[PDB]
C-alpha cells in the first residue's frame, strides 16, 4: 500500500477509492495504450479522410473542469508540431462553449470536436455536441470518455463522423476527483494526435509507466512536504505544464474543500504580480521543463523564489537535481527518453499524491471531500438553455 497505511486504515479515513484509483494508473495506461494500438489504423484513416476533404480544419479539445485541462495541457505541444494553416488546434472548455457558442462554433469552418468526460453526465458535454451539430456545417467528432453508460458515450454510436474511443472501464473514477480518468484520457489524446512514429510512442509509454510507478513507490518523499506548515499551494509550469499546474492545484482545492488556497501560473508569468500570493505558509512547486532553453527560465525563477526566503518550501520536479540552495529537487529521469509532453504523466502522479495526503492531513475524506455538498462528483444544477 501507500505509506504505512493498511487498506483498513484507508477505508476508515474515506480514502480507499481515491488511493486505489491513483495507484491503478500505470495498469490503466497500459490497457489504454493497447486499445490505441489495436485502433491505430482506423484512427489514422479517420483523420486522413478529414485532411483529404478539407483545407483548414479546426480541432476543438473540449471538456469541463479537470476534463478541460486535458486539452489545456496538450495544446502547446500540438500547436508546436502542427501547421495551424491546416490543423488549427484549440482547447475550449465545454463550459465556455455552452455560454458563448457563437464565439467558437462557426458555420463554414470544418471542425473536429474532441469531447472529454469521465462520467459523461455533465449537461455541458451534450449541450456542446448539440450546439456544434446545430451551428457547424461540416462537423466531425472524436469522443474520449471513460463511462460507457454515460450520456456522452451513449449518444456516440453508429455515426461515421464520430470516432468513439472508450477508456478502460476502471478509469471511470468513483472518487470525487478525477485521477486515472484524467491521465487515461490525456494519454489516449496524445497517442492519437502526436505525429511521432509508433515505435517511439511505445518506448516512451514504457518509460512513462516506469517513472510513474517509481513516484508511487516513493510516496514518503511527498509526505515529507505534506508534513510542512502550509495552507497555500502554488503550482508553476511552462508549456504543457501550465495546464498541468491548473489541474495539480485543482486537486488540492477539491480534496481539501478549499482549506488550502491555490494558484497556477508559469514561472516567467509568476513574477508579474501573481508572486504576491506567496507567504510564510505557502509551498511553491514547479513542474520543470527539460529542454536546455526553457529550463534556464525555470531555474532563474526557482533561484529567485528560494532566494527570497519567504515561502515555506520551493520544490522543483525535473530530470535531475543541480543541488540548489533552499529548493527541494525531485529528479525523475528518463535517460532523455521522454520529451516534455510525456513527462506530464509522472509529474501529475506526484501532484495527485500531494493532494490526497494533504486531504488526509486536514481530516477530510478524500473520496467524498465536500461535506457541504456544494461541489459534486457529477456537476449539479446545470441548466441548458435553448440557443437560437
**113-172 residues near a copy of itself, rule: CB under 8 A:** 122, 124
First to last CA, the chain: 54
Contact window for a copy of itself (CB under 8 A) among 165-173, 186-194, 273-281, 315-323:
273-281
Q: Does 371 bind a copy of itself (CB under 8 A)?
A: no
Q: In angstroms, give the least distance from the CB of 201 to a copy of itself.
A: 21
Cβ(193)–Cβ(51) below 8 Å: no
Q: In angstroms, give the least distance from the CB of 126 to a copy of itself.
A: 14
Q: In angstroms, give the least distance from the CB of 194 to a copy of itself.
A: 15
Contact window for a copy of itself (CB under 8 A) among 18-26, 132-140, 141-149, 369-377:
369-377
State the DSSP code for 174.
-
Q: In angstroms, give the least distance from the CB of 66 to a copy of itself.
A: 7
Interface pattern 297-336 for a copy of itself (x via CB under 8 A) = x--x---x---x-x--------------------------
Cβ(347)–Cβ(360) below 8 Å: no
Q: Does 266 bind a copy of itself (CB under 8 A)?
A: yes
Q: Does 278 bind a copy of itself (CB under 8 A)?
A: yes
Q: In angstroms, give the least distance from the CB of 383 to a copy of itself.
A: 5
Q: Among 388, 384, 366, 378, which residue's Cα sits nearest to residue 19? A: 366
Cβ(219)–Cβ(357) below 8 Å: yes
Q: In angstroms, give the least distance from the CB of 293 to a copy of itself.
A: 6
Residue 325, C-beta contacts closer than 8 angstroms, at least 6 positions apart:
306, 307
Contact window for a copy of itself (CB under 8 A) among 78-86, 154-162, 330-338, 349-357:
78-86
- The x, y and z cell numbers of residue 341, run together, are 509532453
- CB 161: neighbour CB atoms within 10 A? 15
Q: Which is nearer to a copy of itself, 205 or 235 (CB)?
A: 235
Show contacts with a copy of itself in window 8-67 (CB under 8 A). Answer: 56, 58, 64-66
Q: Does 382 bind a copy of itself (CB under 8 A)?
A: yes
The whole-angstrom separation of Cα 28 and Cα 170 is: 8
Q: Which is nearer to a copy of itself, 158 or 273 (CB)?
A: 273
Residues in the chain: 388
Show contacts with a copy of itself in window 93-112 (CB under 8 A). Answer: 93, 95-96, 98-100, 102-104, 106, 108-109
Residue 48, C-beta contacts closer than 8 angstroms, at least 6 positions apart:
none
Contact window for a copy of itself (CB under 8 A) among 3-11, 29-37, 269-277, 354-362:
269-277
The order of strands in the sheet holding 110-117 is 87-91, 57-62, 110-117, 139-145, 162-166
Which region, left, alpha or beta, applies to residue 326 given φ > 0 means left and ψ of -120 to 50 means alpha?
A: left
Which region, left, alpha or beta, applies to residue 373 given φ > 0 means left and ψ of -120 to 50 means alpha?
A: left
Q: Which is nearer to a copy of itself, 86 or 133 (CB)?
A: 86
Amino acid at each position: 500500500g501507500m505509506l504505512h497505511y493498511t487498506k483498513e486504515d484507508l477505508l476508515e479515513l474515506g480514502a480507499e477509492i481515491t488511493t486505489r484509483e491513483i495507484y491503478q494508473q500505470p495498469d490503466v495506461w497500459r490497457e489504454a495504450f493497447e486499445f490505441y494500438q489495436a485502433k491505430r489504423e482506423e484512427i489514422a484513416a479517420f483523420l486522413q479522410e478529414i485532411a483529404d476533404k478539407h483545407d483548414y480544419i479546426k480541432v476543438i479539445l473540449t471538456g469541463a473542469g479537470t476534463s478541460a485541462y486535458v486539452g489545456d495541457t496538450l495544446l502547446p505541444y500540438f500547436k508546436e508540431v502542427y501547421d495551424e494553416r491546416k490543423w488549427n488546434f484549440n482547447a475550449i472548455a465545454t463550459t465556455d462553449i455552452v455560454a458563448n457558442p457563437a464565439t467558437y462554433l462557426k458555420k463554414d469552418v470544418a471542425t473536429v470536436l474532441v469531447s472529454f468526460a469521465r462520467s459523461g453526465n455533465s449537461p455541458e458535454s451534450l449541450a456542446t455536441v448539440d450546439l456544434a451539430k446545430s451551428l457547424v456545417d461540416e462537423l466531425y467528432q472524436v469522443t474520449i470518455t471513460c463511462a460507457a453508460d454515460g450520456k456522452l458515450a451513449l449518444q456516440a454510436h453508429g455515426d461515421d463522423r464520430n470516432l468513439l474511443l472508450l477508456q478502460p472501464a476502471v478509469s471511470n473514477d468513483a472518487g470525487f476527483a478525477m485521477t486515472s480518468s484524467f491521465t487515461s484520457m490525456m494519454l489516449t489524446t496524445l497517442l492519437v494526435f502526436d505525429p511521432t512514429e509508433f515505435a517511439v510512442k511505445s518506448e516512451r509509454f514504457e518509460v512513462v509507466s516506469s517513472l510513474a510507478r517509481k513516484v508511487l513507490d516513493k510516496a514518503e518523499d511527498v509526505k515529507e512536504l505534506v508534513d510542512l506548515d502550509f495552507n497555500r499551494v502554488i503550482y508553476l509550469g511552462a508549456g504543457p505544464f501550465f495546464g498541468l499546474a491548473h489541474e495539480a492545484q485543482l486537486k488540492i482545492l477539491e480534496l481539501t474543500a478549499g482549506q488550502v488556497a491555490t494558484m497556477y501560473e508559469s514561472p516567467v508569468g509568476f513574477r508579474h504580480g501573481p508572486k504576491s500570493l506567496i507567504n510564510d505558509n505557502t509551498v511553491v512547486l514547479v513542474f520543470g521543463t527539460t529542454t536546455d532553453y526553457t529550463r534556464k527560465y525555470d531555474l532563474d525563477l526557482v533561484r529567485e523564489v528560494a532566494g527570497d526566503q519567504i515561502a515555506r518550501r520551493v520544490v522543483l520536479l525535473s530530470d535531475q537535481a543541480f543541488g540548489l540552495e533552499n529548493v527541494k529537487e525531485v529528479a525523475l529521469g528518463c535517460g532523455g527518453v521522454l520529451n516534455d509532453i510525456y513527462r506530464v504523466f509522472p509529474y501529475i502522479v506526484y501532484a495527485q499524491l500531494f493532494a490526497l495526503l494533504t486531504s488526509l492531513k486536514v481530516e477530510n475524506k478524500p473520496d467524498t471531500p465536500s461535506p457541504t455538498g456544494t461541489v459534486n462528483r457529477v456537476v449539479q444544477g446545470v441548466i441548458i438553455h435553448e440557443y437560437q
